[PDB]
Amino acid sequence: RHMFLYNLTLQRATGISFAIHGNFSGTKQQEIVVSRGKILELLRPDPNTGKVHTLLTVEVFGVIRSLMAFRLTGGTKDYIVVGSDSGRIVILEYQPSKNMFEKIHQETFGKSGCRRIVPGQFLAVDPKGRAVMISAIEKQKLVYILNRDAAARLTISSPLEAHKANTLVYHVVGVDVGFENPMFACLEMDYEEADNDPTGEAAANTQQTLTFYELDLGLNHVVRKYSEPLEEHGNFLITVPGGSDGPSGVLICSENYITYKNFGDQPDIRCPIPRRRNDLDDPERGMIFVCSATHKTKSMFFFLAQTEQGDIFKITLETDEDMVTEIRLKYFDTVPVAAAMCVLKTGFLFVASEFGNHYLYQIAHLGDDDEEPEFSSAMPLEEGDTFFFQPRPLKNLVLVDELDSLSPILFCQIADLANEDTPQLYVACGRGPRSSLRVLRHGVFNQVAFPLQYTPRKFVIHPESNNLIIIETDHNAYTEATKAQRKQQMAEEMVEAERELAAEMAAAFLNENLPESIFGAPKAGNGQWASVIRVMNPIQGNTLDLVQLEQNEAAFSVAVCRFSNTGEDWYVLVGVAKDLILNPRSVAGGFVYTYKLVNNGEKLEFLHKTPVEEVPAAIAPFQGRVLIGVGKLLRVYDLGKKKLLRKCENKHIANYISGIQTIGHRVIVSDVQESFIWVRYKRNENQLIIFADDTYPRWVTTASLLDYDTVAGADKFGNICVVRLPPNTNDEVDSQKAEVIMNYHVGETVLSLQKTTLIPGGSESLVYTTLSGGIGILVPFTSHEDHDFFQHVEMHLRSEHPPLCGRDHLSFRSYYFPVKNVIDGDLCEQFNSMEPNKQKNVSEELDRTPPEVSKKLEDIRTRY
Amino acid sequence: NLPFLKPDDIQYFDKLLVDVDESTLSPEEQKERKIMKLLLKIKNGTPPMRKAALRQITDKAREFGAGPLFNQILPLLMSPTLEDQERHLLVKVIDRILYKLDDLVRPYVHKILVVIEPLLIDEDYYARVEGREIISNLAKAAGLATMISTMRPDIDNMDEYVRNTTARAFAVVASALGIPSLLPFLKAVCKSKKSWQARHTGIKIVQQIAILMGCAILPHLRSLVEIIEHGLVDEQQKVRTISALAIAALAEAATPYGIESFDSVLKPLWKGIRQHRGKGLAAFLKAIGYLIPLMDAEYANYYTREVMLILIREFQSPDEEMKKIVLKVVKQCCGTDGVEANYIKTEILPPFFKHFWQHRMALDRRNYRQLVDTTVELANKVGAAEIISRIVDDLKDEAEQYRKMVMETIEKIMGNLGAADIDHKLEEQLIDGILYAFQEQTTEDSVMLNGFGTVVNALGKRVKPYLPQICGTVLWRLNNKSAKVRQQAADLISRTAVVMKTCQEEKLMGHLGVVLYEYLGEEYPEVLGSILGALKAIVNVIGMHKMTPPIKDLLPRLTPILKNRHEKVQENCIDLVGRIADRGAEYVSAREWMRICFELLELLKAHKKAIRRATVNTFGYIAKAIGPHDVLATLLNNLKVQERQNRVCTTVAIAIVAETCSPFTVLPALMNEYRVPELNVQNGVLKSLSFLFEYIGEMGKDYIYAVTPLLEDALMDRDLVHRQTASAVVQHMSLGVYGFGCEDSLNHLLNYVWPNVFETSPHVIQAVMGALEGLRVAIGPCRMLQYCLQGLFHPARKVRDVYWKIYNSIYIGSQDALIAHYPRIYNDDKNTYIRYELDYIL
Amino acid sequence: PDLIFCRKQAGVAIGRLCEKCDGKCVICDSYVRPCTLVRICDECNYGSYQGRCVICGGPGVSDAYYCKECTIQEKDRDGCPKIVNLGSSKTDL
Amino acid sequence: QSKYIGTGHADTTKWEWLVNQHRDSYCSYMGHFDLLNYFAIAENESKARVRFNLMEKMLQPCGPP
Ligand SMILES: *C[C@]1(O)C[C@@](C)(OC)O[C@H](/C=C/C(C)=C/C[C@@H]2O[C@H](C)[C@H](NC(=O)/C=C\[C@H](C)OC(C)=O)C[C@@H]2C)[C@H]1O
Ligand SMILES: [Zn+2]
Ligand SMILES: [Zn+2]
Ligand SMILES: [Zn+2]
Structure with a gap:
């Protein structure tokens, strides 16, 4: 009659919306932090066996909308910054001894939920780890300054406002400007003029701009420096290395084009995306990039850009006297459409597809030696004419592992x-x-x-x-x-x-x-x-x-x-x-x-x-x-x-x-x-x-x-x-x-x-x-005793073991309607993940022992 | 008009007193007049006046010009009677005008510097912060070249004070514009051939850059070290000393990263250790001590073995600065991985305890703290017994300062490590020395109390053979004529109660408790609070049945003490009564408990939160002991009789009883008290329900249905206070049972809350809006949007105002949820209004 | 008297309360169930205002906390809770 | 109340409220991953393309006033 339910996830979500790579263990080994949606996972591909092992899985009880890693100067372990639906910014550090995510910092600024003006959707970081910007879709943008202390512990500062009314953000990315004042490139668009003209001319004439927000550390404030209108609307941005590792600047990916831009006397260098030879799709249909990846080496660097069809192109830049010359594109390979690509060291490539299974390939050949045509921006072309290339099976990549995924x-x-x-x-x-x-x-x-x-x-x-x-x-x-x-x-x-x-x-x-x-x-x-x-x-x-x-x-x-x-x-x-x-x-x-x-x-x-x-x-x-x-x-x-x-x-x-x-x-x-x-x-x-x-x-x-x-x-x-x-x-x-x-x-x-x-x-x-x-x-549930017990367990877990990304569990489970007679077992089973002190305290609150509560949870697990 | 003027303001705003007319005076005078007006509105204005004046002075800073602007601002900034917040406001307006002026301030830079630089040496930390901020904004506005050209002539000055000032200001501009911008100037100046004053000033610039920027200098640490290293072998001794001090500053700011940057400095320092003497020797030693915690274990061992000879040699140095330096260096060495504990025990400890642990050091407070911390750090690595055994016999010294020093050292050592390393002889020595130092106290040294407690709790059950002696000493000190000695003995009992109980010596504890009972009622409030805390500890650790004195005779003695005005006595008495009620209620009649409760109602309105929490806990304990019925009847009688000032205490007590003994023993009688047609008691019942539900929160999930009729009767009663308090009840209910299946009763009460939204009185509409937001949380934004849509677009304007206010509250409350709750609005001939993405079907 | 809230972007500063209002919610004047810790903006905590009472502006003795009701309704995300008087200056006490 | 964009007054038009709710819905689609998954499945477009189309619609979701 009365429906008191107990929720338990049997199979965790296998889809992936975000994937970053870094030395989160603090050693030379490179690991991969991924987001399954409401789940944060840490994986490690063993370079010897070429297989991916899952080391950590945490239900954050939120909606991860932006995920990125960073490191401070002189550090040996990349941190993890998470943008959620919580209106909070969260910085975590993986600890291999305890095998858990330690919440290093959690700073509040806004309301909960995937809101339109509250930051969380976009996350950029200064390449030197000195500052991190968290931005929304509209106006609101915040910049936090990161530093160390005497014991080399991360310290965060008060946020600096960087809002601008009636401004839609397409993508934010931190610019590699060496050790100068940190800067963030933004693909913005102002819609104030559009809504005040009933003819529709303002909407058709308002164009997307690329703006640069500079954070002055001496004056300690964020200023909107440069802003250039863009030819065609770009869909995302890529940070090209700078300082002593590159020429700095930004790469914009738009419809059927990729441009390179940089403030100062540097001209704009655009290049059309090569289309498949004898393509079978509609000619009116455009072609954009869906994701990107950057690999830096002591010698050189390159990018990997995947198209809508799944073609991965390797991109290099020609430079003379710290000024770019051309953009060299070359067909690298073709894998299923990925939401994120990670080019790790030790010659490997992790591809997390948007749908279906994910893959881990081995990079055998870089591809430069091949006779296959390399395209550049200096090549003459008619305005309507675009390059052509022939797709072929895997030549430079060999699949070494496959991760099953039931989604969707x-x-x-x-x-x-x-x-x-x-x-x-x-x-x-x-x-x-x-x-x-x-x-x-x-x-x-x-x-x-x-x-x-x-x-x-x-x-x-x-x-x-x-x-x-x-x-x-x-x-x-x-x-x-x-x-x-x-x-x-x-x-x-x-x-x-x-x-x-x-x-x-x-x-x-x-x-x-x-x-x-x-x-x-x-x-x-x-x-x-x-x-x-x-x-x-x-x-x-x-x-x-x-x-x-x-x-x-x-x-x-x-x-x-x-x-x-x-x-x-x-x-x-x-x-x-x-x-x-x-x-x-x-x-x-x-x-x-x-x-x-x-x-x-x-x-x-x-x-x-x-x-x-x-x-x-x-x-x-x-x-x-x-x-x-x-x-x-x-x-x-x-x-x-x-x-x-x-x-x-x-x-x-x-x-x-x-x-x-x-x-x-x-x-x-x-x-x-x-x-x-x-x-x-x-x-x-x-x-x-x-x-x-x-x-x-x-x-x-x-x-x-x-x-x-x-x-x-x-x-x-x-x-x-x-x-x-x-x-x-x-x-x-x-x-x-x-x-x-x-x-x-x-x-x-x-x-x-x-x-x-x-x-x-x-x-x-x-x-x-x-x-x-x-x-x-x-x-x-069968008896009211078990229901009251698990209800008290849920109450105490909500307060002593709060969700990882600052979200409120009771609010998250009441996203659109208030919870009615459901106990979250995914939160209760996290009792075994707490510290022994909190486990002992909560068990003494319920007049039993931690092993008895673990046995009760395992009984519920074996019952089904 | 014009704001108020202080006396000292007249000198700066005299011309504004007379209401002259414009155009009569010179146009240059009209500029000064408006600058005066703007600065007066900024300095002594309201927040809106200050914001408007700031916007005005920024939007016209270029028109006003740097000249008169700063000629009016700078005198006001250096007024001897200027407040700190006025100084901060002036710093902010200076920052804003400097951003607006940009390169127009180049001719005035010098004129500003001679004014701002004193702030960098003021004792006020925030004054120095503001000075640095002003210099940073000035450097960003004028440019690096202007600052270098203006500040260069003071580099080679022979004042040695303006040199330090210029070095500090150059470090400030370096932190403002970045290290790389000033790197070439520093590389040029540090190698100056003209004089050694320029090299000294450049190296002091590097030192101050380190001191100011801390960990931020790690990217350019190699460049700074390579620019500064050549000064270690210079002919001037002052420049070598400042080179070593700046190396130490760079090391301190880079801890613990970047040891490879100091690679070109290790051997120079190592040779200067054997070469130089005096202040240069101390500077070299300080640099080495700050550099060591950055090295690997084996190289740390190597370098420490290399420098330890001269360290031991300088252990017996006459210069006090040298002693401080070598003590810090020893603490840094013996705190790093690589310096073996056996090596410290063999080579470092004998001379350390021979030359440092001398009586004189116990007189100066700085040397006291330094030596104590260094010795505790030594024990943290070499062992507790290896350090305590060398200073334990000094616990019976004639100089009280030396006894205090050794006691604090032993206390910190045993609190950080423990007692597992202590043998039997050292344990006996510790006990004897502690007893001698406690019996021979001139004042009431809290360090002695802390050390006694720490050593006792660290020994644990090992203190049992000495428990009779310690108890006899505590007895002798409890009978002392001085009251502070009695208080210290009571605190020692409070800290050692658990250890005495674990040792199975309950007779001594009972004797202590009966002596505390005898000394109860002491006039001095602090001593009374301390003996009350001691009695509380003894009662908590010992059994209530075998407790001497019996609780039967103890609680009536505690009853009148609650009337004391001192907060410490109040809190201690409350806690003791609560412990008695928790684990010994059987030894007290119900009448005594009722009298205690009635004497306890006042302490619910105390300002001290600790007293409030203690009173709540003890009232809950007593309610659990007796039962809800008699106390609840008496409390309802009090609520009916007493005046509105003491009714909040009754309400809180009712809530405590309802939470402790379940609300089904309290809600029936409280709701029954509503039938009497008196309005004040009805309002009181409503307020009691409001606070009760707010207090119980989730516990009231099984009681909304029962109180719903009383509410719906009060929601529409033609009384303002009734509806206000009923809306408060609804709000607290909704927030309390949020997410526990009360959507039925809450959605019912919503229909009685909603008619009251069209009310004009503010005090009631505020509670109505609070109830509406609580119901939005509890039932969900969907029902609230459903009720708002019917009036969001109404011809009546006031109806639209009210419904849009409610909609704004709901929208701010939960904006992401409303997307799944918005209704359908079909398209027309002009616009598209249907969201087609949500109509997809798979 | 015309008092209001600051509502600026709060930072890393912890709000405090004096002896008169120990353990009281700054938003709704409630004394029950302190939940989340109060944050204020840098302007209200700078200089001689550091560690000062949020309500009156005197020597703060304890940490200011929101109450459970304000936490649930997310009234702690609104901004700086520092009470400010629009009819007084910086020097007025 | 320009702090909160979607708030309204007694003179808030139907077009204003509906473009506000349309932008809210688009940003929610951008946020919730499974909503974007559903839309990319039904429309048979890459997630990047769906996000780009939504951001393009964010300019005038309901058309000119
Ligand atoms: C900031 C202030 O508004 C300043 C000032 C001068 O305002 C007039 O003083 C206010 C102090 C008010 C006090 C101390 C009111 C006493 C009240 O006493 C009744 C009985 C209530 N007591 C409780 O709620 C007691 C215990 C609660 C359940 O638990 C805890 C842990 O508090 C409420 C008031 C305390 C000052 O606020
Ligand atoms: Zn504030
Ligand atoms: Zn106060
Ligand atoms: Zn509150």
């Missing part, structure tokens, strides 16, 4: 399909050509992965054969047929230009297929789509059947059902949308493809397609007939020999339907913006009637009915709610408001919820799987 999980179902006593977790995840369906078994989690064509959206299990029916949909992607057609049209255009050599080149280009899994699927066309239906055996992962779809058709719903009008034959309906152009949302129509599952769920045959007004986003079987959510309309459809007939419908759903789940004679509609709506359908009279809604709106992503009068839902903002209809609720009434009995904030957008039991014989639990790669569970 788009759907998950827990079921026993291998006929073992313990069920397995079937997780459809991955993005684009790197998507996959993975089977997870515990007995930590062991996993196996079967690749997929595109990004999966949903999948259902066939009860008579346990085979999976996957739908894979991607936006602005190209179908196989249209891909071949584009290749053929390009080959036709190639010969119209020596003609014997052109035909040979066209034939060689036609006969060569770059693997999309490693080279990125050539996807373009803002209005185009790509969808594929697939059948797969869950034991060996063999594709039993595959159906490609039309160029402008996007699948969004799937279900396997038996119809009353027919026998026990199995049908499969797939809802599809045509010409879906989102933001601004516009659509033509929708179709529902119907197939007949034959040969005990091994292949399907096309029956008929049923057209419909808008997008059929949800399909749920309702005993004899079926239920379909087309736009804001919820209809019942009966199977006809020709098409699908609408026997009844309701059109009072306020907004777009995203999911539909039915139990008994009831059906739960999941609005995109509003919460759940309860509809009852009498067999007689044939009409769906709305009889209950919610008092709070919720951006629902998935749901799972727990019993007849309850439901549990996941939010778009990383929340989990559990609501329940009031007692004595009849279905023949018009207005009912559902009571919210549980609210919780996980910090990661949950996309799958399911009530099940992992280990047979254990307590029933509620498993959730989120978009960030994590898997968690909620366990209900």
Whole structure:
């Protein structure tokens, strides 16, 4: 009845949003600090074995938005500066003896949450560790001065204001100006003029500026020195070394361009980004860099810039009399799109991909010896003309390690399909050509992965054969047929230009297929789509059947059902949308493809397609007939020999339907913006009637009915709610408001919820799987004694062991709605991580011993 | 108009007294008039006047010109009657005008320096800080070349005082503009051929740069050392001395990094150790002592073995500065890794204790502290027994200062290390010497008390054989005629109670306790507080059942002592009564406890937070002992009878009882006290509920439903104070049960709080806004936004004002959450208003 | 009298309170549950104002703390809590 | 109250409040990692490209007044 839950993360988030490298141990070994989102991890790649070992993992109970390392003059261990959602700046030092992060400094300045004017999003540091700037998206910018003391302990100062009203920051970076006054380059833009002109001229004429904030240490104040308008809007900045190690300045990466700028008499040196030879994407589409990496050596230095397609270019600069001459670009390699790249010493490269697994390669050859074309800014070029290069497999990098990553999980179902006593977790995840369906078994989690064509959206299990029916949909992607057609049209255009050599080149280009899994699927066309239906055996992962779809058709719903009008034959309906152009949302129509599952769920045959007004986003079987959510309309459809007939419908759903789940004679509609709506359908009279809604709106992503009068839902903002209809609720009434009995904030957008039991014989639990790669569970309480005990544990952990990045745990778990009857077990299990004194004190507060509390936590762990 | 003028201000603002007319006087005089007005508004104005005058004087500094501006400012800055904050304001306006003026101050630089430089030698630390700040801003405004050209002629002056002044100012400009800018000037001047005064001044500049910038000089430490090293072999002795002193300053500022920078200095210093004598020898020794903590272990051992011969030789030096230098150098050497403990024990300790530990050193306070710290640092490495055994027999000396010195040394040694290194003979020597030094005290030396306590607690159970002797001595000193000796004995009992209890000697402790009972009621407040603390310690460590005197006879003696006015006696008596109530309530009747509680209600309004906390703790203990019912009935009677000045104490006591004995024994009676139609007692019940919920916080998660009807009756009662206090109750409830599943009762109370937002009185609307923010925290910003949207855009202007005020409160409260709570607003023919990203479906 | 808060960007200075207001919240005048430590800006702690009372401006004896209610509502992020009088000068006491 | 940008008065227009909330939402998308993940999956764009597009929209999120 009463829902008192206990949250426990079984599988930590494996995605990565930030990755830095440095000597955080204080020795010659180089380690890597990464951010999984709400988790700070410290990894160490062993150069001998070439494998990455995880040394520390801490749940910070916040939202890490900026992460960077620095060192003071004469130091031997890099510190860690973290920008969070806390309105606090945090500096930490890893201690290998105790194996933990020690909070060296924590300075407050603003309010909590990822706010728009409160700093935390952007973090720059002076290359000599003398100062660190923390900036927001708007106006507010703060500069802290760092120093040492007698015992070589880091000391921080009061913040210096550097705000400027109506100023949007694109990127901040510290400039290497040797041991001069520290400086920070900012990609800014002033919008004051835009909002005061109703013609729109000011917005089109206001251009992005590059400004320099100089921190005078003698006068001890920050001044906005220089500010130069930029030609085209740059997307991020790179610090080129200065002082005695380089010529200083900044590198700006924009659309189809990279520029070098520096204050003084130094001119601007721009260079166009080389485009892929015989590129398959839309010509109107631009090309930018997604991340960067800098490697300094006693001799020289270089940069690594990865494009949207995944091509890594090595960049060097020519200098004469401390003045740059040109920008030399050379195709280095091609790996999946990374959020951060770390070029470590001892010849290695750690690549943390934005989605999918991460990799660690070995740098064998720098690449200068190769005959491959090097491009420069001094080369003449027409304004529209850009360079061209040929991509090829790995030549300078050799993969020495791969780190598994479940992110991004788009759907998950827990079921026993291998006929073992313990069920397995079937997780459809991955993005684009790197998507996959993975089977997870515990007995930590062991996993196996079967690749997929595109990004999966949903999948259902066939009860008579346990085979999976996957739908894979991607936006602005190209179908196989249209891909071949584009290749053929390009080959036709190639010969119209020596003609014997052109035909040979066209034939060689036609006969060569770059693997999309490693080279990125050539996807373009803002209005185009790509969808594929697939059948797969869950034991060996063999594709039993595959159906490609039309160029402008996007699948969004799937279900396997038996119809009353027919026998026990199995049908499969797939809802599809045509010409879906989102933001601004516009659509033509929708179709529902119907197939007949034959040969005990091994292949399907096309029956008929049923057209419909808008997008059929949800399909749920309702005993004899079926239920379909087309736009804001919820209809019942009966199977006809020709098409699908609408026997009844309701059109009072306020907004777009995203999911539909039915139990008994009831059906739960999941609005995109509003919460759940309860509809009852009498067999007689044939009409769906709305009889209950919610008092709070919720951006629902998935749901799972727990019993007849309850439901549990996941939010778009990383929340989990559990609501329940009031007692004595009849279905023949018009207005009912559902009571919210549980609210919780996980910090990661949950996309799958399911009530099940992992280990047979254990307590029933509620498993959730989120978009960030994590898997968690909620366990209900049995007795009030255990509930009060764990509640007191949570209370004392909130005060004695506060979150690492200055966030308030009770506020973090109440990000959008206040916590209601959920105990955070990830905070409780940190009892074993405290010092013995605090453990003894808190245990004496609860009238027991630290080992007894550890044993209780381990009992909860083994229960599940 | 014009602000107030002090007498000493007249001299600087006489022309502003007469209300003359403009254009009559010269235009140059009109400039001086406005400068006077601006400076008067800055110096003796309100914050808004000061801000406006600062903005005005900065936006017209170029028009005014440096000449008259500084000719008016500088006399005011050096007024003998100028306040420190006035000086700070003048420094700030000087900084601002210097930033605005820039190169216009070049002709006036000298004229400013001769005024500012005295501040660099003033005894006031902040005066020197302000002088350095002014010189920094001036150097940034005038430029490096101007400062060098203006300050160069004073380099070779034969005053030796203006030389130090110029060196300090050059260090200031170096910290202002950076070391590299002044590096060429220093490299040129330190190698001057004209005279040795220029070399001395440049090396003093390096020294002052180190002293001023500290760790910031590490990037340029190599350059500074290479510029300054040549002075160690110069013919002038003063320049060699200043070279060594600046090397020591560079080493101190670079601790512990950068030893490779001093590579070209090790052998010169090592040879000068054997060569030079006198003040140059002391400077070389100081530089070496500050350089040693930067070296590796083996090289530290090598260098220390090389210099230790001359160190031991200079141990017996007549110059007191030399003795201080060698003592600091020894403390630095024996505190580094590399100098073996056996080496210090063999070669350093005998001459150290022979020449340094002499009676005369116990007279001068500086030598006292230096030798004590050095000896404690020596014990920190060579061992506690190796050091204590050499000075323990001196605990029975005739000179009291030497006994104080050795006692403090032993105390610090045993407090930092312990007693595991002490043998039996040394333990007996320590006991005998401590007893002799305590029995032979002229005054009340707190160091003797600290040493006795430290040694006793370090010995632990090993002091049991000497416990009868120590107890007899404490008895003899407790009976002393002087009261301060009695207080010191009581403090010694308070510090050794636990050790005496662990030794299993409860009879001696009971005798001490009965003697303290006899001496209770002492007129002197400090002695009374000390004996109360001693009794508290004895009662806490001994059993209440076997405690002599019995608690039955002890607590009634403590009852009237709470009426004392001295805060120490109050706190000690309260703590003792609380211990008695905690672990010995069975020996006291309920009437005595009730009288104690009624005498304890005043101490809840004390100014001393320690007294408040102690009173709260003891009241909670007594409530746990007796029970909530009788005390709560008496407290409700008091609340009904007493006047509004003593009702806050009753409210706090009610909250204490409700938190100690669970609120379900207090809330029913408190809510029942509301039925009487008297308005003052209803307000009192409301205030009691408000403070009770604020005090219990999370504990009131099971009681919001019970009090909701009383609130909803008071929320709409046609009385202002009723609604105000009820909104306060709602706010404290919401903040207390925040996150514990009270959304139902709180969302109900919101509907009774909301009608009171359209109120004109400020005192009630403030509590209403507080309740609304508390409910925003407890229920969430979503419900608050739902209630605000219906009036955010209303034709009525006052309705819009109020709803936008509430919306601003909610927005400042939680801005990131509102993104998930904003409603839908469809687009029109001109603008796009729907957020399409949030409409994506996977 | 016209009193107000400073609300400037606070720094590393610790706010203090005198003997009259020991352990009292500077924002809401509460005496219950001291939570977070008070920070003030450099201007209110410079010179002879170092370690001075935040409310009245006298010799401070204890550290000033916000209360739990102000901590929960994040009223400690608003700025410098130093009470300032707009009808007096720097020399006025 | 220029200290807090999103605050309002009785003369705050609908366009002003909506562009304020649009900029708030864009900065929240920039902050919360999983929100950006969802947007980059649905739109099939690299996270850098989504962030760049959002920062570009930050100029006039609702259009001219
Ligand atoms: C800053 C001031 O406003 C200055 C001045 C002159 O203002 C008039 O003096 C104020 C002092 C006020 C005092 C000392 C009020 C006494 C109150 O006593 C009632 C009974 C309350 N007592 C408690 O709350 C007691 C204990 C609490 C529960 O626990 C702790 C640890 O305090 C409140 C007042 C203390 C001064 O503030
Ligand atoms: Zn202030
Ligand atoms: Zn005060
Ligand atoms: Zn407060």
